[PDB]
Amino acid sequence: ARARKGALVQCDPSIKALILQIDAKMSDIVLEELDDTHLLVNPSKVEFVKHELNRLLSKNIYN
DNA sequence: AAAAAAAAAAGGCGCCTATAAAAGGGGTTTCAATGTATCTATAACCAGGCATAAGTACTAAAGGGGGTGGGG
């Protein structure tokens, strides 16, 4: 009966957890948790999330 | 004392030895060199047992440099 625009993000559970951590810090990122591997995210924040994930993973001093 | 059987002995018969010289054939009996199965000393064969040399992996060591994380 209702539709809303957004960006669907499909990712592994560990990445889902990381995006939730990003949201908790920055807010206004995650619109809905959909399932263990899917989120609805603010479309204007998708590139931010992708860049931040890359930084979190690639720049980790314990790599 | 007698008849009887068993025994040793004799006499006789036959053939042997050494003598002799000289013409053709067939017999059995013993001994010659040349070979199978079995023997001998030799040479050569396997498997099994002990000692020495070569190769193994193993543990064994010490010496250092570089990168990442934590603390000041």
Side-chain angles (χ1 to χ4, degrees), chain A residues 18-31 49:
Chain A
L18 281 179
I19 294 170
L20 289 175
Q21 290 188 145
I22 297 169
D23 176 82
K25 288 201 169 281
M26 306 303 163
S27 77
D28 205 11
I29 306 283
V30 173
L31 299 174
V49 163

Side-chain angles (χ1 to χ4, degrees), chain A residues 5-63:
Chain A
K5 288 180 187 206
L8 177 65
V9 180
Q10 181 169 199
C11 55
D12 75 67
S14 69
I15 299 290
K16 184 194 170 186
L18 281 179
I19 294 170
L20 289 175
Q21 290 188 145
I22 297 169
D23 176 82
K25 288 201 169 281
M26 306 303 163
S27 77
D28 205 11
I29 306 283
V30 173
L31 299 174
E32 267 194 64
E33 285 186 59
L34 295 177
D35 67 21
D36 299 340
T37 56
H38 297 81
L39 297 172
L40 191 71
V41 171
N42 180 343
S44 71
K45 307 293 168 189
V46 166
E47 296 305 308
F48 174 78
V49 163
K50 285 177 194 189
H51 286 282
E52 181 64 5
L53 285 169
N54 183 73
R55 203 102 208 179
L56 283 170
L57 281 62
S58 77
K59 301 295 151 202
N60 184 337
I61 68 169
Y62 310 104
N63 263 356

